[PDB]
Design an enzyme around this catalytic site. Sequence first.
Site, mmCIF file in Angstrom:
data_model
loop_
_atom_site.group_PDB
_atom_site.id
_atom_site.type_symbol
_atom_site.label_atom_id
_atom_site.label_comp_id
_atom_site.label_asym_id
_atom_site.label_seq_id
_atom_site.Cartn_x
_atom_site.Cartn_y
_atom_site.Cartn_z
ATOM 1 N N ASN A 100 0.902 -1.243 0.111
ATOM 2 C CA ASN A 100 0.088 -0.102 -0.107
ATOM 3 C C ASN A 100 0.850 1.044 0.077
ATOM 4 O O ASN A 100 0.589 2.153 -0.611
ATOM 5 C CB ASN A 100 -0.774 0.057 1.324
ATOM 6 C CG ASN A 100 -1.746 1.465 1.549
ATOM 7 O OD1 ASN A 100 -2.375 1.629 0.818
ATOM 8 N ND2 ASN A 100 -1.355 1.976 2.328
ATOM 9 N N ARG A 158 -8.419 5.406 1.126
ATOM 10 C CA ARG A 158 -7.766 4.878 0.170
ATOM 11 C C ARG A 158 -6.772 5.590 -0.605
ATOM 12 O O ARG A 158 -5.622 5.168 -1.138
ATOM 13 C CB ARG A 158 -8.718 4.313 -0.791
ATOM 14 C CG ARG A 158 -9.346 2.635 -0.716
ATOM 15 C CD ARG A 158 -10.278 2.729 0.540
ATOM 16 N NE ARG A 158 -10.823 1.423 0.572
ATOM 17 C CZ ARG A 158 -11.971 1.211 0.181
ATOM 18 N NH1 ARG A 158 -12.790 2.088 -0.375
ATOM 19 N NH2 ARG A 158 -12.393 -0.063 0.493
ATOM 20 N N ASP A 167 1.707 6.942 -0.226
ATOM 21 C CA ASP A 167 0.853 6.297 -0.768
ATOM 22 C C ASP A 167 0.799 6.054 -2.235
ATOM 23 O O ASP A 167 0.838 6.991 -2.913
ATOM 24 C CB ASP A 167 -0.574 6.951 -0.214
ATOM 25 C CG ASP A 167 -1.711 6.024 -0.176
ATOM 26 O OD1 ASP A 167 -1.661 4.987 0.443
ATOM 27 O OD2 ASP A 167 -2.576 6.111 -1.085
ATOM 28 N N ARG A 195 -0.246 -12.282 2.922
ATOM 29 C CA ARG A 195 -0.854 -11.504 3.921
ATOM 30 C C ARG A 195 -0.609 -10.111 3.382
ATOM 31 O O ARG A 195 0.456 -9.613 3.217
ATOM 32 C CB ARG A 195 -0.298 -11.319 5.247
ATOM 33 C CG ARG A 195 -0.678 -10.388 6.241
ATOM 34 C CD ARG A 195 0.121 -9.848 7.238
ATOM 35 N NE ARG A 195 -0.495 -9.133 8.352
ATOM 36 C CZ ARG A 195 -0.197 -7.629 8.302
ATOM 37 N NH1 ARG A 195 0.477 -7.056 7.660
ATOM 38 N NH2 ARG A 195 -0.950 -7.316 9.527
ATOM 39 N N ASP A 197 -1.049 -6.354 3.529
ATOM 40 C CA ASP A 197 -0.977 -5.565 4.932
ATOM 41 C C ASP A 197 -1.927 -4.277 4.568
ATOM 42 O O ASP A 197 -1.920 -3.991 3.201
ATOM 43 C CB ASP A 197 0.376 -5.092 5.000
ATOM 44 C CG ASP A 197 0.531 -3.860 6.135
ATOM 45 O OD1 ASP A 197 0.368 -4.059 7.182
ATOM 46 O OD2 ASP A 197 0.968 -2.864 5.666
ATOM 47 N N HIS A 201 -6.963 0.174 3.372
ATOM 48 C CA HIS A 201 -6.464 1.521 2.643
ATOM 49 C C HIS A 201 -6.202 1.254 1.074
ATOM 50 O O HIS A 201 -5.602 2.157 0.534
ATOM 51 C CB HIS A 201 -5.013 1.886 3.429
ATOM 52 C CG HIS A 201 -5.322 2.115 4.824
ATOM 53 N ND1 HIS A 201 -6.109 3.228 5.396
ATOM 54 C CD2 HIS A 201 -4.897 1.179 5.888
ATOM 55 C CE1 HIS A 201 -6.324 3.033 6.527
ATOM 56 N NE2 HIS A 201 -5.442 1.930 6.897
ATOM 57 N N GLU A 233 -5.793 -8.100 5.110
ATOM 58 C CA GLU A 233 -5.814 -7.503 6.490
ATOM 59 C C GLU A 233 -6.807 -6.294 6.317
ATOM 60 O O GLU A 233 -6.451 -5.215 6.153
ATOM 61 C CB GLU A 233 -4.392 -7.035 7.022
ATOM 62 C CG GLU A 233 -3.188 -8.250 7.327
ATOM 63 C CD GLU A 233 -3.555 -8.739 8.664
ATOM 64 O OE1 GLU A 233 -3.972 -8.265 9.797
ATOM 65 O OE2 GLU A 233 -3.092 -9.954 8.952
ATOM 66 N N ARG A 337 -4.982 -18.662 12.722
ATOM 67 C CA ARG A 337 -3.516 -18.166 12.687
ATOM 68 C C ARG A 337 -2.960 -18.028 14.104
ATOM 69 O O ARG A 337 -3.776 -17.561 15.013
ATOM 70 C CB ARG A 337 -3.394 -16.758 12.097
ATOM 71 C CG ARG A 337 -1.974 -16.331 12.010
ATOM 72 C CD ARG A 337 -1.993 -14.977 11.348
ATOM 73 N NE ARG A 337 -2.728 -13.965 12.133
ATOM 74 C CZ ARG A 337 -2.945 -12.556 11.444
ATOM 75 N NH1 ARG A 337 -2.335 -12.489 10.261
ATOM 76 N NH2 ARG A 337 -3.410 -11.652 12.212
HETATM 77 CA CA LIG Z 1 -3.699 3.769 -0.269
#
Ligand SMILES: [Ca+2]
Length: 496
Positions: A100, A158, A167, A195, A197, A201, A233, A337
């Site tokens: 991200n 986002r 970002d 996974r 992360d 977002h 996540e 997990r």
């Molecule tokens: Ca983002």
Amino acid sequence: QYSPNTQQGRTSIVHLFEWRWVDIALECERYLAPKGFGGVQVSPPNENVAIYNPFRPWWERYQPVSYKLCTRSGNEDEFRNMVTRCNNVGVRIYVDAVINHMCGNAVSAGTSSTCGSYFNPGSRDFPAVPYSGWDFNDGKCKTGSGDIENYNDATQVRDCRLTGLLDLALEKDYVRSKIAEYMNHLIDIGVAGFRLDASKHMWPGDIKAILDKLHNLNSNWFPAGSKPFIYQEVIDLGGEPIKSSDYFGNGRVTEFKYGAKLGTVIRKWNGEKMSYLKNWGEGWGFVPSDRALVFVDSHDNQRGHGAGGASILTFWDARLYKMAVGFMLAHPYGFTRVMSSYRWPRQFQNGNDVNDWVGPPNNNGVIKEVTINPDTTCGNDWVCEHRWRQIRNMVIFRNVVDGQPFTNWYDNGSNQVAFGRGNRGFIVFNNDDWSFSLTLQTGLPAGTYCDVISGDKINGNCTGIKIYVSDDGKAHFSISNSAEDPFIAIHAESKL
Ligand SMILES: [Ca+2]
Ligand SMILES: *[C@@H]1O[C@H](CO)[C@@H](O)[C@H](O)[C@H]1NC(C)=O
């Protein structure tokens, strides 16, 4: 996306948080494979910023500088070696993919990175990838500060910086390709999944576009057509404009309401009691079981540093923690997990732990090796919860009862409950302030069973509690509220 790709009969993955690759390789061979663990979630394997103030915090690994496999956990050779050895023993590797963002926008330019790569946050320059100002969302974000300011606006969540983190413009094909290039390198190495992360977002559609660029799993270890296991996540608790269901098309999602609610019930906060767990699962408003990745605590919330806050149970609350983990591993909902942590000097002040940033055990910044004591526990401040008899045996319990239905539920209207899994397993809990002594229907075939929480079945004998099941499937259970571990578990494989 949705299948873990674990070896048949293995139902859990363990997060060996901050472990070095060489230690994980060893653990796969000497413990994980023999004990029936399905896989390992590793910390981010790509180069990150080296933060010295505070001194090498755990969160510096969530601030990427490049995609080079070079971190405090080891280099690329050690990484490949780990994947190969673990795969050869049937234990999968799942990579923590931080896609991200890059590092904080306020981080000083220079070569203060885990591999010496140069980077300049101020000018959006990451030559090692490479990325430039055109690859970030600076012009897209509409907030006055450039950071995420209001979570009721699904758009800035986002397009803006999560607490300053640069970002990435994930809608651009170039960016999508550099990310896919990184992930495909890992898939070809042999990893079984990722996974993702900070998925909340990222736009569900941008994630999908990247996943469509991914290779099938390495044909040297996996059958043709195997797709990487994907779990996103996403912290989705109370009403927010973003719903974890928006991400079902890409793979599984973390169900953070799971650990939060289990924690409040077991702590018996505000009227909740274990008898309410009768309809645990979707009945509690959780995501469908086939899209859930569950856990009691995670690396990011075991520090009061996340979703669930103070309700979260961790190794610090050992007695209650083992019971929560036991319930999770015994219950059919989701894919489990297991956490494996390290001790840090918790120092509470005004209700908050000021040392929640402390990184793994180290010698001048060099992560300490995981040493195994003669009793199988770990040294060098590694907690190794996955090695605790009570947790390890429940990991096996889950494998044994895999596929069996939820049955024979019992509760005393308070905190003494029990249930079985088909005719393969049974578990009883006493979380009331008085003793439990009752004959229950277990649904298990007659015989003598070793209680796997208090002991082990060691070749024709039990080292702990022994339960006798009669021909009609009944058996007497006695658990005093003073017991070290207030719960009993028996299954098909602990039968004498
Ligand atoms: Ca983002
Ligand atoms: C079980 O333990 C007893 C001693 O407590 C011993 O007599 C017996 O041989 C053991 N059974 C096996 C199969 O080892």
